[PDB]
């Protein structure tokens, strides 16, 4: 239940993704868990809110993360790749231009088990999650943020 970044594991064992614990709520991408319940030690975490089009899901309570990219500053991907310690990768986002407005995007290509890793602004707030994107052969991830 402690705040932090977590690996999402399945059973040998494999890392299928990453997520963020904040304010007692676990945040990850829908495609990582497909809404399955999660074990945390001897406890169980049940899905509370989810949305396939946003590709997001929260457990134990409503989505808590609300910071947004400022459109000018560098950000950090707090990548938690399979078999590797959590590490920070700094980058200037590009932009996804859509009919409904602009979304920050990071042109970083990490293993699929890194999906759900948080992207941070300079104050350390989570501005979105990594792992839903497009190919241009390089992958580019939206900075996907939910609604609080």
């Amino acid at each position: 239940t402690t705040d932090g970044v977590y690996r999402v594991m399945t059973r040998g064992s494999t890392q299928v993704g990453v997520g963020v614990m904040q304010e007692g709520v676990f945040h990850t991408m829908w495609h990582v868990t497909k809404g399955a319940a999660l074990r945390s030690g001897e406890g169980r975490l049940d899905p509370y809110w989810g949305d396939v089009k946003q590709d997001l899901v929260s457990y134990c309570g409503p989505w808590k993360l609300d910071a947004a990219w400022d459109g000018l500053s560098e950000v950090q991907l707090l990548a938690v790749p399979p078999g590797e310690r959590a590490k920070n990768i700094q980058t200037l986002p590009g932009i996804f231009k859509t009919k409904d407005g602009d979304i920050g995007a990071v042109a970083l290509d990490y293993p699929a088990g890194t999906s759900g890793s948080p992207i941070l602004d300079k104050s350390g707030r989570v501005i979105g999650l990594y792992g839903n994107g497009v190919v241009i052969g390089s992958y580019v991830s939206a900075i996907t943020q939910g609604k609080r």
Partner: protein
Amino acid sequence: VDMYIERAGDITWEKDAEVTGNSPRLDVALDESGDFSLVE
């Protein structure tokens, strides 16, 4: 199928971070299934 979580760190900015990656500007569409696609 047992799906479970393991803590991997604090959420903190690191001053000594590796820096990499471009900043492309891309026109995209988002469909009902959450899939982004390029548009021209």
